[PDB]
């Protein structure tokens, strides 16, 4: 019929993006970074250990004050820790026992969870009548929620398992926009430091870059070949890394529309669970499934240090906003914090 | 430093309240079994317990039958969560071979559960449901298992096979072929760390939850004996 012609012109358009990408692929950093003095050996140590959970820890998030890290586990708890003094501040229970992510607002006022009950429960910290309970239960998805991030105290953009990232409005209680366009399940998303736009990796090896102001898709990067577990932005806004399940990380550019590097090593065989940059962005710290979270060099593409620790896989790896410490949520109810 | 002193004392008092509550509910998180209940589709999982979670208790031990009937059908991401679960109840539809041929799909789904990296240590209860629709399509033959399976014509009814009274031996041959077909996948790959406990669903639930309870007791006892290096 007439429907057959759309596929060949999609391939032709992809060929235009392909050879335009190879047009701007005239060089590589792998020759540029050779003149750069490498960081060499980097060794870090577990500073505090936060043994309060019961089941595996699925996701943590530092506050922007870099003192309080919330963490989220399958026991039904959302324990608001304290990096300086190992003191649980609130053990807020949860209805859905199967939490899959947590979130800390930049103003330190709300935290938010959300898992297999499809509902991104936003928890309130500033109830002065004693304890702390849920304010709004955002419920507009069909599939599960995999990672949610706060923009400010009024709107939260969350990923989902039913292929659609959404921008929620907390006070109203419905989706403002809907970031449709992904094909498979969508695992992680990270906001740019200017908070106007965000990337969102998924389970079709594609890291779509969106724009929350217009509410559309802008750029779709494909350099991976398995489902992308986690991504994170560069602190300047012109780059971001993608750790997928083919045991490699890849640095990209939002201004070249391509990959820039492949952080693949041969001895690692199982894929990245979480990945986040350092403060300056020189150190790309990846978190793996063979129980050790490597500390890559983000420009020389070599392991500048392998961390010790857990006896299960790591699950999340958040770096402080001032870069003072690094925490590693893992699947054995533990949170080693690393300077 | 007295402001830091009452700060430290207040924060340690909050620590004491939190740690006491965490002990008081760790004492019940260690006591409630969780049971992920998944199936293919058109199976009849609601006759077991009676948006998805449900819970019950028999003989002073608790269960949390976490159904997942609201999610998608692309299971490879949200089933990494259920490895802390004790016994993944896998109710199949044994009589969905006339139309999709859901038996081969259920076999491939079970093999994909068994060979996962994170679902290694979790055993599987197996419920060959749709027992009632099984018996008629093998005596009349509106869809043949031997059409969808080569080794059905050259299969022997097993010697240790108990019969239910008032039942044809060909129906027992069919259901025991399905049970040994699942057990072939269950014993071909790794079976030191996890097991399969096949069953046949009856019309009442008072024996069904008893079968679930005795089999979860078996999984706990094999876990403790595996910890002490006995078996």
């Amino acid at each position, epitope marked *: 019929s007439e429907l057959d012609q759309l596929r060949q012109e999609a391939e032709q358009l992809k060929n235009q993006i392909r050879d335009a990408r190879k047009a701007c692929a005239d060089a590589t950093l792998s020759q540029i970074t050779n003149n750069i003095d490498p960081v060499g050996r980097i060794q870090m140590r577990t500073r505090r250990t936060l043994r309060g959970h019961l089941a595996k820890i699925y996701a943590m998030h530092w506050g922007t004050d870099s003192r309080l890290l919330v963490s989220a586990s399958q026991d039904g708890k959302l324990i608001i820790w304290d990096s300086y003094t190992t003191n649980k501040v609130h053990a807020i229970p949860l209805r859905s026992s199967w939490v899959m992510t947590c979130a800390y607002a930049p103003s330190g006022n709300y935290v938010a969870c959300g898992g297999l009950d499809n509902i991104c429960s936003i928890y309130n910290l500033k109830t002065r009548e004693g304890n702390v309970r849920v304010s709004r239960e955002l419920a507009g998805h069909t599939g599960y929620l995999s990672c949610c991030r706060f923009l400010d105290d009024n709107q939260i953009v969350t990923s989902s398992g039913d292929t659609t990232c959404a921008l929620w409005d907390i006070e109203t209680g419905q989706q403002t926009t809907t970031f449709t366009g992904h094909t498979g399940d969508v695992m992680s998303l990270s906001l740019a430091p200017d908070t106007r736009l965000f990337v969102s990796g998924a389970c079709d090896a594609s890291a779509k870059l969106w724009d929350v102001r217009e509410g559309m898709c802008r750029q779709t990067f494909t350099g991976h*070949e398995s489902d992308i577990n986690a991504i994170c932005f560069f602190p300047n806004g012109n780059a971001f890394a993608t750790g997928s399940d083919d045991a490699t990380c890849r640095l990209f550019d939002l201004r070249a529309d391509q990959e820039l590097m492949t952080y693949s090593h041969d001895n690692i065989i199982c894929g990245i669970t979480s990945v986040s940059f350092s403060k300056s962005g020189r150190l790309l710290l990846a978190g793996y499934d063979d129980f050790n979270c490597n500390v890559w060099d983000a420009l020389k593409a070599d392991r500048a240090g392998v961390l010790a620790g857990h006896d299960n896989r790591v699950s999340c790896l958040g770096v402080t906003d001032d870069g003072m410490a690094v925490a590693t949520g893992s699947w054995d109810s533990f949170l080693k914090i690393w300077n | 430093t007295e402001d830091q002193r009452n700060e430290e004392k207040a924060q340690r008092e909050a620590n004491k309240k939190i740690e006491k509550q965490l002990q008081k509910d760790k004492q019940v998180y260690r006591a409630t079994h969780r049971l992920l209940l998944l199936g293919a589709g058109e199976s009849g999982k609601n006759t077991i317990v009676k948006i998805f979670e449900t819970k019950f208790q028999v003989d002073k031990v608790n269960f949390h039958m976490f159904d997942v009937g609201a999610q998608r059908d692309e299971r490879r991401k949200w089933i990494q969560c259920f490895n802390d679960v004790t016994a993944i109840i896998f109710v199949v539809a044994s009589s969905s071979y006339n139309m999709t041929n859901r038996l081969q799909a259920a076999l491939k789904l079970f093999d994909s559960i068994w060979n996962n*990296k994170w679902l290694r240590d979790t055993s599987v209860i197996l419920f060959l449901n749709k027992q009632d629709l099984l018996a008629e399509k093998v005596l009349a033959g509106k869809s043949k298992i031997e059409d969808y399976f080569p080794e059905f014509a050259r299969y022997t009814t097993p010697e240790d096979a108990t019969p239910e009274p008032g039942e044809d031996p060909r129906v027992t041959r069919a259901k025991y072929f399905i049970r040994d077909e699942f057990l072939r996948i269950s014993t071909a*790959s790794g079976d030191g760390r996890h097991y399969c406990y096949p069953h046949f669903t009856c019309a009442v639930d008072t024996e069904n939850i008893r079968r679930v309870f005795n089999d979860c007791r078996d999984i706990i006892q094999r876990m403790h004996l595996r910890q002490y290096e006995l078996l």
Partner: nanobody
Amino acid sequence: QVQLQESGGGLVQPGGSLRLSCAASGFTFSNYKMNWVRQAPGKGLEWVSDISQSGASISYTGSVKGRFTISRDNAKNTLYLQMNSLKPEDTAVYYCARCPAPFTRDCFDVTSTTYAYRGQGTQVTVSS
């Protein structure tokens, strides 16, 4: 970037012999356990074949056991499913899928639409 072509195919006589060849491009083909999934027009998908990484572990659907054969070419990134002695009840479109994780023994790709790593297929039909 994954791209799965499904070369060959067409319309066969009942009893013919067709070699369906899956051309792949975008990844290390030697790592990922492939398969070959079909869907008859009118019902859902059903999984027909697989193969292991090296080529050792091979299964089939029991209705198509022995009548079809399956082989992979690691040096050419190509997957051949050669059919023999066809039947009227095997009219379907044949998607060359791929299990999604490298260096694993299990996969969840028999399921419904919007699976990622699964080519557009090749509609095959037997004669009257």
